[PDB]
Design a protein around this ligand. Structure first.
Ligand SMILES: O=C(O)c1cc(O)ccc1O
Ligand SMILES: O=C(O)c1cc(O)ccc1O
Ligand SMILES: [Cl-]
Ligand SMILES: [Zn+2]
Ligand SMILES: [Zn+2]
Lengths: 314, 314
C-alpha cells in the first residue's frame, strides 16, 4: 500500500541522534517508487554510520540525497556538540529552500537537540522561528497546526504568555492563520475545507457579555473570510464546536485551546506542522534520543506516519 | 444495586416540564431505603399531576416532601408561564437552603426553562450564580466542577473575558477553588484525591519563559496546598497533564481549559456541579422538554446518573 503521493524533503536532524537511523528505517519500508519521491538532506557520513549499525548499506545506493550540514569530524553517536547543532540547522534550511523553490511539496525534519543548536550560537525557539528566518518572514506570520485523531487545529498565537497573545491578536493575524491553514489543507488531501474559528473569550464572548475581544477581532476576521468566498463558521466557543466534530479545520486563538484536545485524543501520534509562505514542515513527535543513538533500536513509526500525513493523496 | 448513600434534596424544576415526571420515575427505580434519603422540593400539585399521567399514585405515600414553589392555579403541562418560572426558583432555593442548613448533603435541580424564569422578572445566568445569591456569596467564591469520562475538573475562573480572568487570578483564589473541589471529591467517593493544577500560561510558563504568572500565582498556591497535606502536582501544561490521566482532580485556570476536554470526551453523560460553602448542586444535562411534558415519554436515566454521582459511597 502506497503512502507517498508527492515529493518530500527529509532533513535528517541532529546527526549524532536517531534522526539518521529512523530516516533509513522509514525509507527501507517504502517501495522504490516511493523512495524516489523523498530527497534526503543531511551529511552523508551520518547516513553511512546509521547504515552500518542498521545493516542497510544496500539502501544508500537507491537514495536521492543532497549533502547538507557536512561534518568536519567523524560522527559521535550520542554526544551533544555544536557541530551537530549546525548540521541540524543547515540540513533543515536546505530542505526548506527546496520546498520554497518548488522542488518538493513539503518538508519533514527529523529530531534536533536544542542544546546542540544553542551551543553553536544559533537562536532557536522552534521550527516556526527557523522557517520565518529562512523565508525572511515575521515570526508571527508562521503558524503551528496540530494534526491528530482526525482533528486539524491551526493556532493564531503559540508560545507566549496568554496576556501577550491577547495583546498581539488582531483581525489580520487570524486571517493570515486561516489562509496558511487552508492552503495546508490542500496538501493534506482536503482542498476546500470547512472551517470553524474558536472564540477568544468563553462562548466567543456571548456577543460582548464576556468581553469585547471577539467583537473586535474574530467577528471582523470571519466576515472578511466569508466575503472572500471561504466557508467559515464562528467565532464559536471552542468547547462547543469541537464536540460537534463537523469541521475539517479549527482555528485556536491560544496554545492551550488547540493543544489540550489534540494531546487528549492523541497522546503519542500527533503531527506538528509549521506553515509559512508555501512551506509546510513537520517535526517528528519525539526527541533525538541520545541515550539510544547508534544502538539501532529506535522506532521509525512516528516518522512513517508523518510521511503518510504529508504524503496524502489529493 | 444501591446508588444513594447519603441525604439529597431533589428540586423538581419547572413544574410544567418533565422535571416532576422524571423525579417520580427516578424515585420509583430506587429502593425504599434509598427513597428515605431523598427529600423532594417543589409543588405537590405538579407531583400529583405527574403521578396521575404515569400511574404512580402508590409512590406518593412513600415520598419525603417539602412544599416549595406552590402554584396559584392548576398545572398546565407544556406551557411556559412566569408562574412556573418562579416555582422553579423557589423549589431550588428551598433545596439549597436545606443543604446550607445541614439537613442534606447535596442538591439536584431538575430542568428549568429560562424563558419561564425570565418572564417572572427573575435574573438567572445559571446554577452557579443562583447558588451564590441564595448563600449570599460573591459569584467568584462559587466554583464549577465538570465531571465526565473519568475527568473531574474544577475551574478557578469561569464566565468572563480571558483578560478579566487573568486579572482576577491569585494564590488565594486557586487555594479556595481546590479546597472546594477537594471537599466535593470526598462526597463523590474519593477521600484522598491526587490533584493536578493547570498552568495559566502555556507549559505552565516554562519556568518564566512564557510569563511570570505561574511563578506568582499557581506555584505559591501549590506549595501552600502541599504544606497543608494535599498531594498536588504542577503547575503543569493543561494539555500534557490531562493526557496522562493519572489524577483524580484537575484545576483549570480558565473556562476553556476545562470545558474543551469534558465536552470532547463526554458530549453526553457529563455533570456540572456548582460548589459553594458546604453546598454541592448539580443540574441534569437536559432541558424541560415542553414538547413532551406530561405525555409520559421522558426517561429518567440522566437524573438517576446524577443521583449516582452525588450519592456515591464514601
Ligand atoms: O507540544 C507543545 O507544547 C509544543 C512545543 C513546541 O516546542 C512546539 C510546538 C508545540 O505544540
Ligand atoms: O458549558 C458551557 O459553556 C456552559 C454554558 C452555560 O450557559 C453554563 C455553564 C457552562 O458550563
Ligand atoms: Cl415557596
Ligand atoms: Zn507548546
Ligand atoms: Zn460556560
Amino acid at each position: 500500500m502506497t503512502i507517498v503521493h508527492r515529493r518530500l524533503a527529509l532533513a535528517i536532524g541532529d546527526p549524532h541522534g536517531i534522526g539518521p537511523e529512523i530516516a533509513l528505517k522509514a525509507l527501507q519500508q517504502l517501495s522504490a517508487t516511493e523512495r524516489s519521491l523523498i530527497k534526503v538532506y543531511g551529511p552523508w557520513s551520518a547516513l553511512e554510520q546509521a547504515a552500518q549499525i542498521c545493516q542497510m548499506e544496500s539502501l544508500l545506493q537507491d537514495l536521492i540525497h543532497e549533502e547538507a550540514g557536512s561534518l568536519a569530524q567523524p560522527v559521535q553517536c550520542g554526544e551533544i556538540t555544536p557541530q551537530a547543532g549546525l548540521s541540524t540547522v543547515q540540513s533543515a534550511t536546505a530542505a526548506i529552500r527546496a520546498c520554497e523553490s518548488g522542488e518538493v511539496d513539503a518538508v519533514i525534519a527529523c529530531p534536533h537537540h536544542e542544546t546542540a543548536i544553542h551551543r553553536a550560537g544559533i537562536a532557536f525557539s522552534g521550527y516556526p522561528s527557523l522557517l520565518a528566518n529562512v523565508l525572511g518572514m515575521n515570526e508571527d506570520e508562521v503558524f503551528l497546526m496540530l494534526v491528530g485523531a482526525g482533528l486539524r487545529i491551526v493556532h493564531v498565537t503559540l508560545h507566549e504568555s496568554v496576556r501577550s497573545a491577547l495583546e498581539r491578536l488582531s483581525p489580520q493575524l487570524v486571517i493570515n492563520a486561516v489562509d496558511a491553514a487552508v492552503q495546508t489543507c490542500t496538501l493534506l488531501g482536503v482542498p476546500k475545507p470547512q472551517v470553524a474559528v474558536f472564540g477568544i473569550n468563553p462562548h466567543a464572548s456571548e456577543g460582548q457579555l464576556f468581553g469585547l475581544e471577539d467583537s473586535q477581532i474574530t467577528v471582523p476576521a470571519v466576515e472578511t473570510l466569508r466575503k472572500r468566498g471561504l466557508t467559515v463558521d464562528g467565532p464559536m466557543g471552542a468547547d462547543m464546536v469541537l464536540a460537534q466534530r463537523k469541521h475539517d479545520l479549527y482555528v485556536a486563538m491560544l496554545h492551550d485551546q488547540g493543544h489540550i484536545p489534540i494531546k487528549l485524543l492523541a497522546p503519542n501520534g500527533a503531527s506538528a506542522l509549521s506553515i509559512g509562505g508555501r512551506v509546510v514542515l513537520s517535526s517528528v513527535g519525539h526527541g533525538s534520543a541520545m541515550d539510544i543513538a547508534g544502538r539501532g533500536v529506535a522506532d521509525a513509526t512516528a516518522l512513517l506516519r508523518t510521511i503518510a500525513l504529508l504524503g496524502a493523496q489529493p
